Design a protein around this nucleic acid. Structure first.
Ligand SMILES: Nc1ncnc2c1ncn2[C@@H]1O[C@H](COP(=O)(O)OP(=O)(O)O)[C@@H](O)[C@H]1O
Ligand SMILES: Nc1ncnc2c1ncn2[C@@H]1O[C@H](COP(=O)(O)OP(=O)(O)O)[C@@H](O)[C@H]1O
Ligand SMILES: Nc1ncnc2c1ncn2[C@@H]1O[C@H](COP(=O)(O)OP(=O)(O)O)[C@@H](O)[C@H]1O
Ligand SMILES: Nc1ncnc2c1ncn2[C@@H]1O[C@H](COP(=O)(O)OP(=O)(O)O)[C@@H](O)[C@H]1O
Ligand SMILES: [Mg+2]
Ligand SMILES: [Mg+2]
Ligand SMILES: [Mg+2]
Ligand SMILES: [Mg+2]
Lengths: 228, 120, 320, 318, 319, 158, 228
DNA sequence: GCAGACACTACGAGTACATA
DNA sequence: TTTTTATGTACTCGTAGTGTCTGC
């Protein structure tokens, strides 16, 4: 019931999406931002044996970085979370699950309207250039028959007219023309190769990132234009 | 403030005495509106206890943990008897800039900071 | 029939909170503009305000979002700071609801003054996200909502019905409270209790329900319980005669009879003298009783200050 | 009847633990015993201008009789960030033990915390499932009306005449038990009766006077003289106004300023027989006016002197 | 014929004017804008009116659209100091290959503690005003530091002359007609729209909204007219019973407002100040303020509120 | 006769250390000796509107005759954040040699201290086991009645 | 007198207990809390010459943080403290010894009623867990033979019911039962090893921390219980 | 094998508000 | 023709010091 450092690294990522988390027993974890903005699901290497809801996941792991990694976690008779160390013990209070906005069931992502496949280092460079060019919102669309991502500076761009980047990704074999806008603040996924699934029907839409262990559903923007 | 300004002019004092009594918990817009039809005539007029004494008075008050009234009397009796100059030196260490600037910011708390310096 | 029990709530007035807009008790025109919004499928910017508490605002807000089936964001206004507006609310308004349900933000209890910088930022916030998202505001001090923000919303004044609406709202609240007692097993021995509870706590329906719980301790709304609502602590009788004949010997020895029942007795005294004295001696009664009531508390001898009222009454009112 | 030990200060050493041990008006206890009967505690505001009535004790006893996850909070420390922080932090914590959480906010009637109050508006409706809030106040109009709506407003220190008689009798038997546990011998039992009546609704100062009046170690008839004090008659006072003198009634006020309520409560009664009929209405108008302001009056002795001067003028006497 | 933003649903912005000629302004101001657009480059302009919804942000956007300008719209509340030095300068120093005038609209700029960012903007207008111009829309003009008004062309909205008001309301009565034509609202009585425009005038955003709230039936019959002309109430029943010295209704309305005493006493003072004579203004605030002073000291709060009603009836000389 | 020889003002230098040394009327001298005899001190508001009667000396004399761990502070410097910080850190902790802990608030009837006064009700009850409070009052009405509930109102008799 | 790095750091620690310090001739420095809850003492390697009282010890160390390590701290011929640098020279005004509340009474600790030792990294983990877990009071008792330190949330937890942290520090030998509660606030020792000495008899008691250089004697909270 | 740079906190300033 | 007094609270902003993370 100890938590490996890659699992906790994934947990500290989920804390960026939602300040809390509701995790039941098993190997599957998930969370969704309160403002329905992002949703992450992932199966991991450790096994949770008991349902527990954590009101402050950020502070939980920040405290869990103070005991040795061999720390045995458990549900104490003190009905909270017991962090047994070599000498010390941390009784982190379990929270009432009603106070943690969490997906009551995993979001079954619909059939993708368009499929591409971002690379991990391509995603890495995209974050580096955004922090340098103040890129706040990006758009994934078609350019000369290929699926590309284009970032803007919605602060200075407003209308989103002046392109500031173009990560040419895959090729598009369909006939549809789409302009899906994602907010960079909702790019809460950890770096890693992702199969990008796009869906949009009418005035709805969402993007899914299938990972080697962690999946992420990030929301599209109000101005996303498509012909699906 | 607005009541305390009309507190200098005694002809405006009947309405100021009322707002002192019952004007508590009365609307700001109502407060100006009451004083509109309440003050007699207009033609706005003039205006509405020194530094080097008021540092000693407030310094003796903090030392002996006494009030203004008691502190004021302390100095007045010490000016007459056993060397107030001696107790001035006893209190040269606790004249911090936070103490000083608290009374008369402007530019005096620097001509007062090193005013009571020369007391040894 | 339609009444919603939250079950997960133990505190009554939150268990029986209305779920749909029809279950709300509203003036006909106000219910007519809420059903109109639901039938339009789209929600505008709205401010639900009232100086009286618990008129329906927070519930009608949630109820309007339910009937629309809205991706709603319930937010405590006191906790909605400018950075929270710059942040998750702007990141919420710019979403695109994965199931297409129109987004709504509910800023609950937003009449606060410290969050003025949030409202100043909210002026151009609502205008920038009129598609996708809209804001329902629950306030108690409308003037706490800055007139620009008031302009951007539809301002619906709760707890202030026309007389023809007030009658139909109490009538519904009585039939409601009757169904509440059925759910809760409270015996309505005297229906005039329910009417008194509704009439006395109008238009704070939350306090009406809370009063029902306070007085359903015995589980039966008997006639003695009505005498607790109206706090009908009997008649006065002996004082009225002892004034009508100016009997000071009795009046001064009769003042201790109501020293521990002052607030009720002063109310009952004015209530009975109103019908038992000449028309312009009514105004002299409220002039000296209202004063005597106003100075109770700061009165040294509360018994003597009641005898002061007796000797002043007997010497100035002429009984019709 | 439950000693606290630990403390040394009687009134705090004998504070009731259960609501049944609490002495308070009949209907209040029945509403209290009904709340504990339900097993769950609503939002309650226990208030009374008169201090030492049991409001705090009832709150701590209400959580005790229910086995609540009580978190006691000095309301003067219940700032908005403190509501945002420890209050939510505690209300959002899981109650796997089945205990209901109750935030007890003692002395929460302050005016500067209105912004903290206005946050609790939706806080209480949000966590109303298992958390509840007992508010204890003296000035109940310092609680914003949207919170009095959310709470059960139980007013202390406002008993019926029948409750006063039984509550005094319940405080008599309690006090003599305090003396048994404390080692104070009771000779003249009427002392304990005058100790309860002199400070009736304030049961705290009631015990505070017991400790103060046990200085002899016994409650003899001399202690009862110390409790009902001056009395006698308003003789010299009555011939002061009867002579319409100068300095004699002016310097007579401090002896009767302390027991002002009783003094006026016997001055008008003694004078009623010997001051004509058309001035019996003028004397009660003057005395009543001077009586109802005894509170806004800062110098009780000067207030009495002001009553004497205007009495010496407008009284016809004989 | 009216510009619609067919993704708005909210009326009050679905039909927001696009150009100056679509706006409803006083003739001189409307002419002064058409001439400012004709001259090519926009000056530094402060658009202000304390009464909201008069045309500020619309005209600010309409000037940028008429000129076809590379407009940078910004919420004046997020216009902090690191913003004026940051994305504002980055935009002002961008290359205008397009030739269109760079204009920065700072919407809702008048704010409390933005003083340092405000003076920075003034000093910014001595450096980059060569390239770009700035349109400010504010409610309180004073919230704007004096150096900015000294530089900017201050056009005061919502303060029209009588003849300008008459024509503006008539134009607005035709706008709401063209709104009702395009939305699907039946205008059964034309005096509805006239009373709609007139009741809440200078705020054009609010009067369009009021039309939306009164469109709940789909038709503007005379019943809706009776609604708009119904002057509502707040505490109209107490004011009415106070003018009539009706002791019966004062006796029955005191238990109506003893619940929220502190609000009612404040609302009562606000209403009587307009309805009562000036020599009575003295006795008014004295009677009320004293009654509120003893509020809570009075044992019976309901009777104490009736005491206020009796005291006012006897002492108020009415209008 | 107690002298604080390090003092420069005769008012502060010849301040009685014992309640016996205080020049006080009968009944009072009997009262205070009875209070010090108990060995434990309850909350005391001793007050006299006449200046120079001995309000401050008696408040300190009771702390000495009972061998108290006294913390004497003037009311004016006794604000609410002063009560939250130091005054609480004092009354919460138990002194190393035992002995009564006392907090004397001199001239606490000052008007601006109304809200910090309102903090003490519950403060005094939470730490009544370890520490008591003596209040020196000039105007007794300046003390909120909930504090008089918790204190013994000693008025210096004629 | 010369002030080295280890001694100024100690004065930076003693400043936290008392805004100033009184130090007389020798190598022994000592300060007590104004309310009388935390007493600190330290024998040092730097020897001071005269007797001096500093009212603003915090500001005194800040002004000293510009002079080179050769800092000559001397008495002024009138009385003040001049600070001679390699080049510059500063003048600081000294204060009267009665302005700074001095401990004055270094009466030795009695007999240790209980003895254990807390490690440097164990105090470190206690202070770092409390920073993340909001622990305001700690109680030292016995559990299953070994003695432990338990941390609570006195505000969030009235009578110290639910533990939030527990650190074991070795086993107890004698057959005694106790629970000394210490306030975390009035606990101002610097990082390092401290042989924990605990004395308490009847209703009085204290906790002494014996560091390799300095000693810290804090007071125990009144709620503490023991059978000594 | 640490620097850099973003990320976080604290604090002075200024602001607005409610009391006596 | 003038320009200021106390206490307590909550919020925003700016900047500056400190903390955690990363390079061709
Ligand atoms: N208009 C109403 N119709 C029906 N019930 C109401 C209404 N107003 C209040 N209530 C009662 O009070 C509670 C709702 O209070 P709420 O409207 O949330 O308070 P506020 O309006 O002050 O935000 C519900 O549980 C309900 O029982
Ligand atoms: N109703 C009561 N029944 C029994 N004892 C009481 C009652 N009211 C006060 N007391 C005594 O006074 C103390 C409680 O005062 P408390 O209720 O805390 O004051 P407040 O009501 O102002 O908070 C207890 O120690 C108790 O001995
Ligand atoms: N002068 C006007 N002419 C036409 N419509 C207007 C005018 N002023 C406001 N409106 C209406 O109000 C909305 C714009 O309000 P606006 O004036 O931009 O806000 P503010 O005046 O508060 O900056 C638009 O949807 C428009 O329909
Ligand atoms: N009863 C007394 N016995 C002896 N000395 C007194 C007495 N009352 C006052 N004094 C002298 O007056 C000085 C100040 O008294 P203080 O306690 O300040 O009285 P108050 O606080 O009422 O002004 C003391 O130094 C003391 O020497
Ligand atoms: Mg609400
Ligand atoms: Mg209490
Ligand atoms: Mg605008
Ligand atoms: Mg004194």
């Amino acid at each position: 019931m100890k938590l490996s450092k890659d699992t906790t690294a994934l947990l500290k990522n989920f804390a960026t999406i939602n300040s809390g988390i509701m995790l039941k027993s098993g190997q599957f974890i998930m969370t969704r931002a309160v403002n329905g903005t992002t949703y992450a699901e992932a199966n991991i290497s450790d096994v949770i044996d008991f349902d527990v809801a954590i009101y402050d996941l950020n502070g939980f792991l920040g405290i869990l970085s103070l005991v040795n990694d061999d720390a045995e976690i458990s549900q104490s008779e003190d009905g909270n979370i017991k962090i047994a160390d070599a000498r010390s013990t941390i009784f982190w209070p379990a929270a009432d699950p009603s106070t943690v906005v969490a997906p009551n069931k995993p979001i079954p992502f619909p059939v993708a309207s368009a499929v591409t496949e971002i690379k991990a280092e391509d995603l890495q460079q995209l974050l580096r250039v955004s922090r340098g060019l103040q890129i706040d919102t990006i758009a994934i669309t078609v350019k000369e028959g290929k699926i590309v991502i284009n970032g803007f500076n919605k602060v200075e761009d407003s209308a989103l007219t002046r392109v500031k980047y173009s990560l040419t990704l895959g090729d598009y074999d369909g006939e549809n023309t789409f302009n899906f806008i994602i907010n960079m603040a909702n790019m809460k996924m950890q770096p890693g190769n992702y199969k990008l699934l796009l869906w949009a029907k009418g005035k709805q839409g969402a993007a899914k990132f299938e990972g080697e262990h962690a999946n992420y559903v990030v929301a599209l923007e109000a101005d996303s234009t498509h012909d699906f | 403030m607005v009541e305390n300004a009309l507190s200098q002019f005694p002809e405006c004092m009947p309405a100021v005495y009322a707002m002192n009594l019952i004007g508590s918990g009365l609307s700001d817009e109502a407060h100006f509106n009451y004083l509109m039809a309440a003050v007699p005539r207009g033609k706005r007029y003039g205006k509405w206890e020194d530094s080097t004494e008021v540092l000693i008075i407030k310094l003796l008050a903090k030392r002996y943990q006494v009030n203004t009234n008691d502190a004021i009397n302390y100095k007045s009796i010490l000016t007459k008897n056993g060397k107030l100059p001696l107790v001035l030196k006893e209190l040269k260490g606790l004249v911090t800039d936070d103490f000083l600037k608290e009374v008369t910011k402007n530019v005096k708390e620097q001509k007062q900071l090193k005013k009571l310096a020369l007391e040894w | 029939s339609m009444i919603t029990v939250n079950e997960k709530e133990h505190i009554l007035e939150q268990k029986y909170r209305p779920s749909t807009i029809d279950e709300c008790i509203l003036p006909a025109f106000d219910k007519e503009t809420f059903k109109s919004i639901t039938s339009k499928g789209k929600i505008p910017h709205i401010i639900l305000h009232s100086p009286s508490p618990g008129t329906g605002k927070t519930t009608v807000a949630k109820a309007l979002c339910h009937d629309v089936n809205a991706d709603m964001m319930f937010v405590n206004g006191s906790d909605c700071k400018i950075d929270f507006v710059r942040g998750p609310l702007t990141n919420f308004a710019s979403a695109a609801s994965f199931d297409g349900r129109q987004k709504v933000i509910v800023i609950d209890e937003f009449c606060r003054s410290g969050l003025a910088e949030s409202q100043r930022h909210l002026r151009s916030f609502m205008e920038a996200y009129s598609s996708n998202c809209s804001i329902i505001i629950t306030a108690n001090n409308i003037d706490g909502i800055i007139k620009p923000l008031q302009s951007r919303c539809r301002v619906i004044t709760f707890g202030q019905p026309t007389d023809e609406d007030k009658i139909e709202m109490m009538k519904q609240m009585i039939r409601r409270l009757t169904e509440i007692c059925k759910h809760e097993g409270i015996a309505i021995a005297d229906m005039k209790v329910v009417a008194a509870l509704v009439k006395k706590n109008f238009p704070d329906f939350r306090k009406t329900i809370g009063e029902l719980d306070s007085y359903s301790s015995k589980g039966v709304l008997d006639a003695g319980i009505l005498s607790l609502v109206t706090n009908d602590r009997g008649a006065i009788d002996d004082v009225l005669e002892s004034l009508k004949n100016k009997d000071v010997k009795q009046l001064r020895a009769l003042a201790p009879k109501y020293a521990a029942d002052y607030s009720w007795f002063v109310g009952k005294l004015a209530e009975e003298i109103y019908s038992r004295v000449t028309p312009q001696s009514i105004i002299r009664m409220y002039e000296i009783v209202g004063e005597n009531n106003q100075y109770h508390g700061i009165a040294a001898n509360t018994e003597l200050h009641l005898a002061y009222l007796f000797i002043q009454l007997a010497c100035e009112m002429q009984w019709k």
